Design a protein around this ligand. Structure first.
Ligand code: CLA
Ligand code: CLA
Ligand code: CLA
Ligand code: CLA
Ligand code: CLA
Ligand code: CLA
Ligand code: CLA
Ligand SMILES: CCCCCCCCCCCCCCCC(=O)OC[C@H](COP(=O)(O)OC[C@@H](O)CO)OC(=O)CCCCCCCCCCCCCCC
Ligand SMILES: CC1=C(/C=C/C(C)=C/C=C/C(C)=C/C=C/C=C(C)/C=C/C=C(C)/C=C/C2=C(C)CCCC2(C)C)C(C)(C)CCC1
Ligand SMILES: CC1=C(C/C=C(\C)CCC[C@H](C)CCC[C@H](C)CCCC(C)C)C(=O)c2ccccc2C1=O
Ligand SMILES: CC1=C(C/C=C(\C)CCC[C@H](C)CCC[C@H](C)CCCC(C)C)C(=O)c2ccccc2C1=O
Ligand code: SF4
Ligand code: SF4
Lengths: 740, 73, 80, 139, 134, 31, 154, 43
């Protein structure tokens, strides 16, 4: 029964509540007797569930809060392209994308910081960029600055509309709870319009604008000689010369004579030799196929015409012998709790973001991205990290659903109740797996690290010694190299040259080549499996044991965020679902940090490097990965100690900021250790003595000062531990790759 | 680990291992005499700092001696 | 095992007994003219030592303390 | 003076002065920098060295900066001390700490230029120190 | 000791080897209705209309359950301690009156007539075998 | 007398741990 | 179809759950008729069969992967190295036996009381048989692998 | 009302941001005209 239900003018728009803080909560609204009130104000600002219990009030805040968030992203995205318009070398970069490095940031001639605007290239003095926005605009067919200047103003205009929306909705026209609960209507709309039509539209831009323009640009024509996009639409003579399939018109589409469009809807599946990047026609045929699949898929659900599926009926009818009632009650949990929806969306979105990073490096989808190793490395590293954070957030809100929104009446002998009733077996076996892998993933390094020191290189786990080869992956590789012909016959070249095939060379660089898998990759892939399993153990344990444990029978009453539940029973320290998330983040950081290290050294040693006319590929680090990555000292020597030479020696040059942020990052990491190792008890007694000196000199504060709370001290530490950690490798990855 | 990670996480973890060992077929024959429990709060502080110190002492001695011995000043 | 000692600053709020997970504390009649109720700790053997009694006491400093001592199966919270 | 020479005549200083790397937008910022630094004392490396002895021959190094700081810093403490005391007489003290009463604060910020006089006045006879017997203490 | 078991499929979280060897516990309660209640160690279970009985590994599981029972307006919950030899002892409402409410028959235990500041120093009491909290 | 190293080293690595941990494990577990 | 997972026995209060892996027809026979649970055997015969299985198992890793695997005395190192490991395994039993070991547990797959491992005598007799059978299994595996070329050469 | 807006500006963050930006801009702007200032040159 889809319907638009709205409440008119629930909440006014006065500036009164701005002045008095803590309006959202009653405890904070009383007054700030203590400095912990300040920290609690921020920690409870987005805890709408604590402010009120009416789901209408919660959902209205959430739906409007999203709009204010989009304005921030649009202002950001519009801000990036604006810098490309005014302060940049993009117009000059198109003339020579292989000799001019991309820059869009300029720092003013104030104290000593004009050095950062070095000779990046093209007569422009600016900071070199690694986000890859230059390659995106070329994929968008943007060839002049005024074109970019127009798009930036459009984003700022779009920002006000989103901003106007959240005001209009929370204050003037607030939807009721029924408007959000019609799930079946929501999913049809997003799949078909937001994803389907949005994909179908982008196919139009690629076919009409990007593919023709880029087909002229790689040919060798000057940038000024390229016609504008509207010129292609009006004058069809120019379009037919490149893609003669358009001469037939739209009649082959309706008559199902779709082969006439083969020129610009190809299935080559390889990279463009001229510009390192996938073919625009292949990308053009991409979104058209995606849109039809999405448009069709979204009609599955009923949305108030009797035709379609009810998700409740799908889930309930998937019972089985082993699972008692199957998926019964999950629809009720997901329709009565925002945290459950947030946990599912975060977890799979994070895994998606990691899945993007692996596709992009092997299948570079933009022109000249592969030759820019700096953009390629930071791009992979970026999304790899963002996906790791979002996955951990999924476990947190998964546990928050348990303490706050779990209904035992609904979850009775269902798939979830049955999972909690054997949680001991889930963790005890996952405990066994984590120990098994940590021994047989890291112990093999120690055996190699120990043997090479003893002068016994024959007894190692190396390619000449006992080698454990990854036969399973090498088998899967050959199937992809042979997909040209046989299975997937119409494809001319494989989906990626990473699986195998011939080498591709752009200028003097190499875009991609076969990534051979040896003993080193067999070990590192297990190291990843080891580190991934442990954070799952930490996070999954918090979800199941948040309600109760053998130690604590009533853990839900204390809440999701409680420090200890006392010092007895031995010690109940960090027993909450919150503290599991706190611990899992360190392991998320540990696991994710080896992935990018596996990426950096392998791609530099095996893949990237200058290429000669005869095909001789002079790799960057000289193929040292196979015989050095098997030992821990090899990474310390060949990866960290050696490649960090550019960072420390960056002083007196344009990359000096990276050497500073690199060194400064170690500080914040160590500053984290104040809060993790210490405890609130010592610090409150220190403040006591300091308060005496103020009471002496009559500088005593009315707001009585107290040390930080326990969970805050843990939160403050992990924030520093990760910020100081990530910023370190951030500068090392940047300064090293930018020099080479 | 002993500094950052504190007891209450580990005791619950050990309780699962107690379940499996008591409910596994063949290792059910053998059983602890003293009940296994997580290290106390003060103990983990003791174990953690010795680890902090022993690592601190050793890895600098290696650097102090090897750097000086290799060059011999 | 863990000794629970009560002092004269009690005022009969009874908030300590309601917080006890294991029912160690029990209110008893104060024969004097202070109130009709003052706390006690008869079943001290089941004191796990979670200090919930102390957090619930409204005095300046505690009317009831929990001095830790020897451990047992009942105190360590072991279900095995 | 210890292991150093005058900065004007040191060769290593003149060697760096030719390549000064002007900081600001002004082209001659580099040459103007090394010109003023000729007054100071320099070492073998070519960089200048400051002497905080307290001798009046070299007082711009630390002594003049020292006086300029303490006048500025005492302004901040005297202002904060007076604003905090004035609030305590009012009823709602905690809210005024967060939501500042600018009507009370800006008159105090207008003062503070004469903080040394008020400091001596409170020290000689006044409220610069509270008694030890009337302050909270541990056992 | 009599009653009916709450109807649930079972759970790993529950009774272990300690029950056979030493001091398993039990809890009894009676409800007019038959609702769904969360168990002390994971899971959910229904409850019969008369004389429900559940075996628990510790005393903390029962009072934690009893607090949940009070949400359903059930105030008659009795906890036992069953030894390996079958000896049962009625514990939690040791008298008919609950602990939070006062009863005349009870006596004060481990009460110090002094305040905490008045306790002696440790140096005043060393090698005597007595503690400061006495 | 370099052969003594071949006899005294493994005694420290194998015989001494086995004998000490054997007695201690029984001593700590005694009643 | 209906449920496959049930509570241990009639009581759902107890921890263990009846599952296919725990309470299938096939698994119950194998585990209960293994020497550690087989009915009608003395403690000595149980340890002999167990050790004989383990000495034959432990010879392999030392020989084909230990040091001197690529040498003439490779198979000999496996026999001596395995016996040294069996002796430590034998010593461990004597300590667990001579420390008043509490009891042996009964699970769903082995519902009855498992065996007479409820005393020091049962474990001590188990230990004496482990060394006898344990050394025997390794000696067997040595002569086969060393003379496997001859046995095929026949 | 304007009285409510003034209270918002007088709060801790906005008062701190307005003040620190002013003190920052002074040092920032003074340093572009008077570049280096390692010490006070003494006549
Ligand atoms: C500190 C004392 C100590 C000493 C003296 C040794 C000595 C030895 N270790 Mg060892 N080890 C020690 C501590 C010590 N370990 C510790 C603390 C660890 C833990 C990390 C290890 C881990 C370790 C591993 C992982 C390995 C060794 C191996 C070896 C042997 C290698 C000899 C060789 O050149 O190849 C072999 C040369 C040969 C001629 C074959 C060796 C035949 C064995 C040693 C005969 C032993 C007979 C045995 C004791 C019989 C007892 C029966 C009796 C009780 C009835 C050697 C006997 C290696 C090995 O395979 O030994 C078998 C091996 O793989 N050790
Ligand atoms: C259908 C299956 C089958 C198979 C595969 C065999 C195979 C064999 N039989 Mg046989 N047999 C069978 C059924 C079978 N039999 C039946 C049904 C009968 C009843 C009529 C017989 C009666 C019979 C007699 C009477 C004799 C054989 C012999 C033999 C062997 C002679 C090989 C040769 O040329 O000279 C010899 C070649 C060699 C390479 C030497 C062989 C050494 C033996 C086979 C090694 C066995 C080790 C053994 C696995 C240890 C068991 C312990 C283990 C279970 C743990 C050969 C292994 C002859 C023999 O003496 O074998 C020793 C012999 O005299 N068989
Ligand atoms: C047009 C002006 C206007 C006015 C006068 C109000 C007034 C009000 N709104 Mg409202 N609102 C507006 C616009 C406005 N809103 C818009 C445009 C949106 C859509 C985003 C909303 C969405 C909204 C929600 C969802 C809620 C309110 C609420 C409120 C009330 C309390 C707000 C408060 O005291 O916190 C004042 C808080 C601030 C001034 C801080 C806001 C920070 C902004 C939004 C984000 C800044 C991001 C920034 C880039 C991060 C940088 C970080 C780094 C650099 C340090 C109050 C009546 C709340 C309410 O009624 O409570 C029951 C409530 O729940 N409003
Ligand atoms: C049929 C038209 C079509 C075309 C021409 C492409 C073209 C492309 N896809 Mg693609 N894709 C399609 C349909 C298509 N897709 C559909 C229908 C799906 C959903 C299942 C996907 C899902 C998909 C993913 C997840 C990824 C690509 C990627 C790519 C690029 C890699 C190079 C290659 O050989 O293609 C590969 C083409 C295929 C593997 C064929 C898929 C056909 C499916 C199996 C049919 C579905 C039947 C139900 C290329 C631009 C990669 C990319 O973005 O590069 C950066 C990438 O990671 N595609
Ligand atoms: C879609 C993303 C998303 C959303 C909508 C939420 C939303 C929420 N989370 Mg959540 N979370 C997420 C992702 C998300 N989270 C991820 C990825 C993690 C893993 C790190 C977590 C971990 C997490 C925990 C552990 C907790 C929450 C909690 C909450 C709730 C209250 C938070 C609050 O008061 O905000 C205000 C939050 C703050 C003021 C903290 C500020 C943290 C700053 C931004 C860190 C600095 C990072 C910055 C980039 C550093 C550089 C700049 C700096 C140097 C200037 C709220 C419902 C809390 C709760 O009670 O839920 C019921 C809670 O306990 N979340
Ligand atoms: C380098 C430091 C370090 C190491 C080695 C570990 C090790 C471990 N942590 Mg961990 N941890 C650390 C830092 C570390 N942690 C920090 C800083 C934190 C705070 C965030 C945590 C937080 C944390 C949590 C929250 C969890 C772990 C878990 C684990 C275990 C995973 C199982 C495994 O890998 O098998 C064991 C593997 C090893 C011990 C690796 C080295 C072993 C070598 C190869 C063998 C030694 C050779 C030989 C036998 C020596 C004999 C010598 C003889 C003389 C005695 C393992 C014990 C998880 C766990 O226990 O789940 C099972 C878990 O839940 N840790
Ligand atoms: C934890 C990982 C690991 C692994 C896999 C190995 C592996 C190895 N090490 Mg080594 N080592 C390690 C860590 C590891 N090491 C560490 C951390 C150190 C530093 C102390 C060393 C130091 C070291 C030295 C100094 C030496 C070795 C040597 C060896 C080799 C001989 C092994 C041997 O004789 O053991 C024998 C092993 C056994 C008797 C037990 C095997 C257990 C089996 C495999 C269990 C299987 C379970 C089964 C699948 C499940 C049953 C299911 C059931 C239901 C049916 C072998 C390649 C030796 C060598 O020369 O290398 C070539 C040697 O001298 N190691
Ligand atoms: C084994 C595969 C799962 C096969 C599987 O899940 O079986 C699925 C089987 C199906 O039961 P139902 O038919 O009741 O499920 C019906 C569904 O509609 C209800 O969700 O259920 C079980 O047997 C439970 C076993 C779970 C525990 C199995 C062990 C899980 C091991 C951890 C995963 C390892 C992954 C390794 C590969 C990457
Ligand atoms: C399929 C299957 C399976 C598998 C199995 C296996 C893998 C087996 C094992 C195997 C083994 C583990 C074997 C072993 C055996 C051994 C033996 C065969 C022994 C021998 C012995 C002997 C013969 C000795 C004798 C002696 C003595 C005692 C003394 C003196 C000397 C002599 C030498 C005379 C399972 C069950 C898992 C599961 C289910 C299914
Ligand atoms: C240091 C530390 C503290 C003490 C840390 C404190 C009190 C942080 C204080 C942060 C700032 C400095 C508070 C004051 C901020 C001022 C009001 C800002 C002045 C205004 C100008 C800056 C404009 C804990 O409370 C703690 C608790 C638990 C585990 C570890 C620790 C821990 O390590
Ligand atoms: C891992 C871990 C555990 C579990 C650790 C356990 C149970 C210890 C297991 C180690 C075993 C006993 C092997 C250790 C062997 C040592 C190498 C030698 C110790 C013997 C000396 C007496 C010589 C805690 O109990 C804990 C408690 C509080 C904060 C952090 C932690 C913590 O991090
Ligand atoms: S320490 Fe815990 S169990 Fe003991 S009386 Fe206090 S609250 Fe109750
Ligand atoms: S003062 Fe403390 S112990 Fe005494 S009655 Fe009140 S809460 Fe209970």
């Amino acid at each position: 029964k889809a319907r638009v239900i709205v409440d008119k003018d629930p909440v006014p728009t006065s500036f009164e509540k701005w002045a008095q803080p803590g309006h959202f909560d009653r405890t904070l609204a009383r007054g700030p007797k203590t400095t912990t009130w300040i920290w609690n104000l921020h920690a409870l600002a987005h805890d709408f569930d604590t402010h009120t219990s009416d789901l209408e009030d919660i959902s209205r805040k959430i739906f409007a809060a999203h709009f204010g968030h989009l304005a921030v992203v649009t202002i950001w995205l519009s801000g990036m392209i604006f810098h490309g318009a005014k302060f940049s070398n993009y117009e000059a970069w198109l003339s020579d994308p292989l000799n001019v490095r991309p820059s869009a940031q300029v720092v003013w001639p104030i104290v000593g910081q004009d050095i950062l605007n070095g000779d990046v290239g093209g007569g422009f003095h600016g900071i070199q960029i690694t986000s890859g926005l230059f390659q995106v605009w070329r994929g968008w067919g943007i060839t002049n600055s005024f074109q970019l200047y127009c798009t930036a103003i459009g984003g700022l205009v779009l920002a006000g509309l989103f901003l106007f929306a959240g005001w209009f909705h929370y204050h003037k026209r607030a939807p009721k709870l029924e408007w959000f609960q019609n799930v079946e209507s929501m999913l049809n709309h997003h799949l078909q319009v937001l994803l389907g039509c949005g994909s179908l539209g982008w196919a139009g831009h690629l076919i009409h604008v990007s593919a023709p323009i880029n087909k002229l640009m790689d040919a060798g024509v000057a940038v000024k000689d390229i016609p504008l996009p509207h010129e292609f639409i009006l004058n069809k003579s120019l379009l037919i010369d490149l893609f003669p399939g358009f001469a037939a018109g739209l009649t082959p589409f309706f008559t199902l004579n779709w082969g006439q469009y083969a020129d610009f809807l190809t299935f080559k599946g390889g990279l463009n030799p001229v510009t390192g990047g996938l073919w625009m026609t292949d990308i053009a045929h991409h979104h058209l196929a995606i849109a039809v699949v999405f448009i069709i898929a979204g009609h599955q659900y009923r949305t108030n015409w009797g035709i379609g599926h009810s998700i409740k009926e799908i889930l309930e009818n998937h019972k089985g012998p082993f699972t008692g009632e199957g998926h019964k009650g999950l629809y009720e949990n997901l329709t009565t709790s925002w945290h459950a929806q947030l946990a599912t969306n975060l977890a799979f979105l994070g895994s998606l973001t990691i899945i993007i990073a692996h596709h992009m490096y092997a299948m570079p989808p933009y022109p000249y991205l592969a030759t820019d190793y700096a953009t390629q490395l930071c791009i992979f590293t970026h999304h790899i990290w963002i996906g790791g954070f979002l996955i951990v957030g999924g476990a947190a809100h998964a546990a928050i659903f348990m303490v706050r929104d779990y209904d035992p009446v609904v979850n009775q002998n269902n798939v979830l109740d049955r999972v909690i009733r054997h949680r001991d077996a889930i963790i005890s076996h996952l405990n066994w797996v984590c120990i098994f892998l940590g021994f047989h993933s890291f112990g093999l390094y120690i055996h190699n690290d120990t043997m090479r020191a003893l002068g016994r290189p024959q007894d190692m786990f190396s390619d000449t010694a006992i080698q454990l080869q990854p036969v399973f992956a090498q088998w899967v590789q050959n199937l992809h190299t042979l997909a040209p012909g046989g299975t997937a016959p119409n494809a001319l070249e494989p989906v990626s040259y990473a699986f195998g095939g011939g080498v591709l060379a752009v200028g003097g660089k190499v875009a991609m080549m076969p990534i051979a898998l040896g003993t080193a990759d067999f070990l590192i892939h297990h190291i990843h499996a080891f580190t991934i399993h442990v954070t799952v153990l930490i996070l999954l344990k918090g979800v199941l044991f948040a309600r109760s444990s053998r130690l604590i029978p009533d853990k839900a009453n204390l809440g999701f965020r409680f420090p200890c539940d006392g010092p007895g029973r031995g010690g109940t320290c960090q027993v909450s679902g919150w503290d599991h998330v706190f611990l899992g983040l360190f392991w998320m950081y540990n696991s994710l940090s080896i992935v990018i290290f596996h990426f950096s050294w392998k791609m530099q040693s095996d893949v990237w490097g200058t290429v000669d006319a005869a095909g001789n590929v002079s790799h960057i680090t000289g193929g040292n990965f196979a015989q050095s990555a098997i030992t821990i000292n090899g990474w310390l020597r060949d990866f960290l100690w050696a490649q960090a030479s550019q960072v420390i020696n960056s002083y007196g040059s344009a990359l000096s900021a990276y050497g500073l942020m690199f060194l400064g990052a170690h500080f914040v990491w160590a500053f984290s250790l104040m809060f993790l190792f210490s405890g609130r008890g010592y610090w409150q007694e220190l403040i006591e003595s300091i308060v005496w000196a103020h009471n002496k000199l009559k500088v005593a504060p009315a707001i009585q000062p107290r040390a930080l709370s326990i969970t805050q001290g843990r939160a403050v530490g992990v924030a520093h531990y990760l910020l100081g950690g990530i910023a370190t490798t951030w500068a090392f990855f940047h300064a090293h790759i930018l020099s080479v | 680990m002993f500094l950052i990670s504190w007891r209450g996480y580990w005791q619950e973890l050990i309780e699962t291992l107690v379940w499996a060992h008591e409910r596994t077929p063949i290792a059910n024959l053998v059983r602890w005499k003293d009940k296994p429990v997580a290290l106390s709060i003060v103990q983990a502080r003791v174990v953690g700092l010795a680890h902090f110190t022993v690592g601190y002492v050793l890895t600098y001695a290696a650097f102090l001696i090897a750097s000086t011995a290799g060059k011999f000043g | 095992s863990h000794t629970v000692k009560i002092y004269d600053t009690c005022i009969g709020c009874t908030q300590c007994v309601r917080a006890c997970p294991t029912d160690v504390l029990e209110m008893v009649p104060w024969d004097g003219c202070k109130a009709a109720q003052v706390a006690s700790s008869p079943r001290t053997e089941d004191c796990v030592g979670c200090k919930r009694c102390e957090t619930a006491c409204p005095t300046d400093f505690l009317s009831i303390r929990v001095y830790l001592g020897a451990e047992t199966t009942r105190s360590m919270g072991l279900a095995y | 003076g210890a292991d150093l020479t005058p900065c004007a005549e040191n060769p290593a200083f003149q060697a760096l002065a030719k390549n000064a790397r002007n900081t600001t937008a002004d082209p001659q910022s580099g040459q103007k920098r090394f010109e003023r630094y000729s007054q100071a004392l320099c070492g073998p490396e070519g960089y200048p060295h400051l002497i905080v002895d307290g001798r009046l021959d070299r007082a711009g190094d630390f002594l003049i900066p020292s006086i300029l700081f303490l006048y500025i810093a005492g302004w901040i403490g005297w202002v904060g001390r007076a604003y905090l005391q004035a609030i305590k007489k009012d009823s709602d003290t905690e809210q005024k700490e967060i939501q500042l009463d600018l009507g009370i604060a800006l008159p105090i910020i207008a003062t503070g230029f004469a903080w040394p006089a008020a400091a001596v006045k409170e020290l000689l006879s006044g409220e610069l120190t509270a008694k030890d017997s009337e302050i909270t203490v541990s056992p | 000791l009599s009653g009916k078991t709450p109807l649930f499929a079972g759970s790993t979280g529950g009774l272990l080897t300690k029950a056979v060897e030493e001091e398993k516990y039990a809890i009894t309660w009676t409800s007019p209705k038959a609702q769904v209640f969360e168990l002390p160690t994971g899971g959910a279970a229904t409850m019969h209309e008369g004389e429900n009985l559940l075996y628990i590994a510790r005393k903390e599981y029962g009072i934690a359950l009893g607090g949940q029972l009070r949400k359903f307006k059930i105030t008659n919950y009795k906890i036992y301690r069953i030894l390996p030899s079958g000896e049962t002892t009625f514990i939690h409402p040791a008298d008919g009156v609950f602990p939070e409410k006062v009863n005349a028959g009870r006596e004060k235990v481990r009460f110090n007539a002094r305040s905490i500041g008045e306790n002696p120093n440790p140096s005043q009491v060393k090698f005597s075998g007595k503690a400061t909290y006495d | 007398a370099s052969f003594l190293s071949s006899i005294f080293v493994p005694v420290i690595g194998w015989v001494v741990p086995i004998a000490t941990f054997s007695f201690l494990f029984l001593y700590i577990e005694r009643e | 179809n209906r449920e496959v997972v049930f509570p241990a026995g009639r009581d759902p209060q107890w921890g263990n759950l009846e599952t296919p892996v725990n309470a299938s027809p096939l698994v119950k026979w194998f585990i209960n008729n293994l020497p550690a649970y087989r009915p009608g055997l003395t403690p000595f015969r149980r340890g002999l069969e167990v050790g004989m299985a383990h000495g034959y198992f432990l010879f392999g890793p030392f020989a084909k992967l230990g040091p001197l695997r690529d040498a003439a005395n490779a198979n000999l190192a496996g026999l001596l190295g395995a016996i040294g490991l069996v002796v430590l395994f034998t010593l461990a039993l004597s300590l667990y036996a001579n420390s008043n070991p509490p009891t042996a547990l009964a699970s769903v797959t082995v519902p009855n009381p498992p065996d007479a491992f409820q005393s020091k005598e049962g474990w001590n007799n188990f230990a004496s048989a482990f060394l006898i059978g344990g050394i025997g299994g390794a000696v067997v595996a040595y002569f086969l692998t060393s003379n496997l070329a001859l046995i095929q050469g026949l | 009302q304007s009285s409510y807006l003034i209270k918002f500006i007088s709060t801790a963050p906005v008062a701190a941001t307005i003040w620190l930006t002013i003190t920052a801009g002074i040092l920032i702007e003074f340093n572009r005209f008077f570049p280096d200032l390692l010490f006070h040159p003494l006549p």
